[PDB]
Each structure stands twice: as structure tokens, then as C-alpha cells.
């Protein structure tokens, strides 16, 4: 669904409390982006639907390490 492929981050359910404390159901969505990452150790291109928060940890560690860590736990 609308979940990250490398972390499994799902959406969140919450409220939409107004000024008069009126509450209504609401969905906090994940900032998913469809990037095209280049594998430097294999010269290959993959198309994932990762989030902007895990793009940050990709830039922090490396795409290979993030992929090898997401391979465990069943892509979650």
C-alpha cells in the first residue's frame, strides 16, 4: 500500500481538533517519494517508493547498507 519499502512505515490515525475542541477522524500520511537509486557497487538502477525520512538515512549511511538492513525483517 502507501508504505515505505525499506522501513515499512505506515500512516497514522488521529484527530482534527478544531478551535472549539470538535474532533474528527484524520489520517497522517507518509511522505512517500518514487526515486530511482543508483547502486554504486553494482552499477544498477532500482525504482523504490521510499520516504523522505529514509532518504535522509540513505544519504547518511549509504544505499548498500540501507538495502542490506532492509533485506532483513522482510522489507520492513
Amino acid at each position: 500500500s502507501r508504505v515505505c519499502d525499506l522501513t515499512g512505515k505506515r500512516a497514522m490515525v488521529g484527530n482534527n481538533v478544531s478551535h472549539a475542541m470538535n474532533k474528527t477522524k484524520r489520517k497522517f500520511s507518509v511522505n512517500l517519494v518514487k526515486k530511482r537509486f543508483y547502486l554504486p557497487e553494482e552499477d544498477r538502477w532500482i525504482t523504490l517508493r521510499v520516504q523522505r525520512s529514509t532518504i535522509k538515512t540513505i544519504n547518511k549511511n549509504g544505499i548498500t547498507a540501507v538495502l542490506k538492513k532492509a533485506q532483513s525483517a522482510g522489507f520492513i
Partner: protein
């Protein structure tokens, strides 16, 4: 970021030197074109300076 240049950059230059660029310039251009490598676990792996 913290990249290690491989061939040359117009404004960066001086290959084999740690450079700090904006995240999105090394990931979309330098990494795919082979000009730099994101090397955090390599500051010690760069032993060619010996």
C-alpha cells in the same frame, strides 16, 4: 554530506579529498556519474595517503 571526489569537479576539484556538499548534488549527480563516493566508513579506509 561527506564525499570523496574521484576525477574532478569544476568548483570542487582536488580529487581524494573530503568535501561537504548539499544532499541532492552528490546523490543525484556525483554518485551516479562516478565523480564522488559517499564514504562515511572510509575515513580510515583511505590509506593511500601513506
Amino acid at each position: 554530506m561527506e564525499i570523496i571526489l574521484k576525477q574532478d569537479v569544476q568548483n570542487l576539484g582536488f580529487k581524494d579529498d573530503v568535501v561537504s556538499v548539499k544532499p541532492g548534488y552528490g546523490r543525484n549527480f556525483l554518485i551516479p556519474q562516478g565523480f564522488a563516493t559517499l564514504a562515511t566508513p572510509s575515513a580510515k579506509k583511505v590509506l593511500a595517503e601513506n
